[PDB]
Write a structure and sequence with these properties.
mainly alpha, E3 ubiquitin-protein ligase UBR4, 1 chains, 58% helix, two-stranded parallel ribbon, ligase, 5% strand, 24 helices, Ubiquitin ligase Protein quality control
Length: 466
């Protein structure tokens, strides 16, 4: 408990003593890194059970009906939290204030002779109002009905002073999170992740590690370092994500989904920082295989897919030959299931998420050579109504087909930063797409047509055509 320089020295020595411990012991690093995370952002005591005392107004005791014997009220009890509107409702129900329950502004809660808006959370109000002068004391609230005693003279706090969410030095309450990056502590926890081979005995260590990583990825110097290839973070946490996914598949409700979405966040932030300023950074397409089967088991992993698609054609061909047959839009309109529509949306999102790179361009060209874009063009040419008036029942029936919005989505995804797809779509489907643009539907078919037109507008010839 002191200055910043001594804090930095203490964390340097903390990483130093973390080093000497091996990669197999799974207990002491838990404590070291949870201490790191706790002193990273000073934890605020969010008590799961804090007593709330709801007392009548001494000047309005006679007017209020019914006494409440439940004081003090526990937070875990129903009617207390997470919003003080629930507290007001509980007060009305206990005091049989049926009329006042419906009226939100007819009754007010006073804390330290201050008015608090009903929308503010109970925990935040207790921490920022009651704890400022009466820390360690029961949460006292005086309920009084508005109007009899004249205009309120107490201060009204509509909103509380939240933490500084701007970029002040935003890793400033996370200044600690740059310290071990400066001293080279990042590789220590990276090897700690590299040393994880079990999920049953490594849930707590992984949890503290991901929490500290989420705290640290909001640091300029941390993400700048993570851009570098020397510490090869991508492979390590891709392996950890794969382990989490297989553990989740083995046993449901083991916490795998939460850790998976946190890893997804670390992907999106790391790749965004890297692109702000790689072929072997993510590896070949070998891991793309079981990533695809996990997909078969949402935008984050589909956006990661192109980065992991820097490999051999015999593995993108698996994706292509799995995603081709179920695009039978004739059969889809005739008969399709929920799995088919999930699979179609996955295909559309994959097409949307293809990055503009050499291997991405190769994948797009290979997909186009399969004629699935040609299949979509044939489906529009065959099934679009020829009626000039767009309000005809034929047009509405055509819009009612579930395949059309997905086809528009996949065409837009294949038509971004791809001249060949743009030329192919704009060769003959321009009048049909323009007609579909003018029509508004409950499924957003017109909006999707407009987006597809904008995507095709990248090519100057197609833009001139439109």
């Amino acid at each position: 408990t002191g200055t910043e320089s001594e804090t930095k020295a203490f964390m340097a020595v903390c990483i130093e003593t973390a080093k000497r411990y091996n990669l197999d012991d799974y207990r002491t690093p838990v404590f070291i890194f949870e201490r790191l995370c706790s002193i990273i952002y000073p934890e605020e005591n969010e008590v799961t059970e804090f007593f709330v005392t709801l007392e009548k107004d001494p000047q309005q005791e006679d007017f209020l009906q019914g006494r409440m014997p439940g004081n003090p009220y526990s937070s875990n009890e129903p009617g207390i939290g997470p919003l003080m509107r629930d507290i007001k409702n509980k007060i009305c129900q206990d005091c049989d204030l049926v009329a006042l329950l419906e009226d939100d502004s007819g009754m007010e809660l006073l804390v330290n002779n201050k008015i608090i808006s009903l929308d503010l959370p109970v925990a935040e109000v207790y921490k920022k109002v009651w704890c400022t002068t009466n820390e360690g004391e029961p949460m006292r609230i005086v309920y009084r009905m508005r109007g009899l005693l004249g205009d309120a003279t107490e201060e009204f706090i509509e909103s509380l002073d939240s933490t500084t969410d701007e970029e002040e030095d935003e890793e400033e309450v996370y200044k600690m999170a740059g310290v071990m990056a400066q001293c080279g502590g990042l590789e220590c926890m990276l090897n700690r992740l590299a040393g994880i081979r079990d999920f049953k005995q490594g849930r707590h260590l992984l949890t503290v590690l991901l929490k500290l990583f989420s705290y640290c990825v909001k640091v300029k110097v941390n993400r700048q370092q993570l851009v570098k290839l020397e510490m090869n973070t991508l492979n390590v946490m891709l392996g950890t994500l794969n382990l989490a996914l297989v553990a989740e598949q083995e046993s449901k409700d083991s916490g795998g989904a939460a850790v998976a979405e946190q890893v997804l966040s670390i992907m999106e932030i790391i790749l965004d920082e890297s692109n702000a300023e790689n072929l072997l950074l993510t590896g070949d397409k070998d891991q793309l295989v079981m990533l695809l089967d996990q997909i078969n088991s949402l935008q984050g992993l589909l956006r990661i897919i192109p980065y992991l698609s820097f490999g051999e054609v015999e593995k993108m061909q698996i994706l292509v030959e799995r995603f081709k047959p179920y695009c039978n839009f004739d059969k889809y309109d005739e008969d399709h299931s929920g799995d088919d529509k999930v699979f179609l949306d996955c295909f559309c999102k994959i097409a949307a998420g293809i990055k503009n790179n050499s291997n991405g361009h190769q994948l797009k060209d290979l997909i186009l050579q399969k004629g699935i874009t040609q299949n979509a063009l044939d489906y529009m040419k065959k099934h679009i109504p020829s009626a000039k008036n767009l309000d005809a029942d034929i047009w509405k029936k055509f819009l009612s087909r579930p395949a059309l919005p997905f086809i528009l989505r996949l065409l837009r995804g294949l038509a971004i930063q791809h001249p060949g797809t743009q030329v192919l779509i704009g060769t003959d489907s321009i009048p049909n797409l323009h007609k579909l643009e003018q029509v508004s539907s409950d499924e957003g078919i017109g909006t999707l047509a407009e987006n597809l037109l904008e995507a095709l507008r990248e090519h100057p010839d197609v833009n001139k055509k439109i």
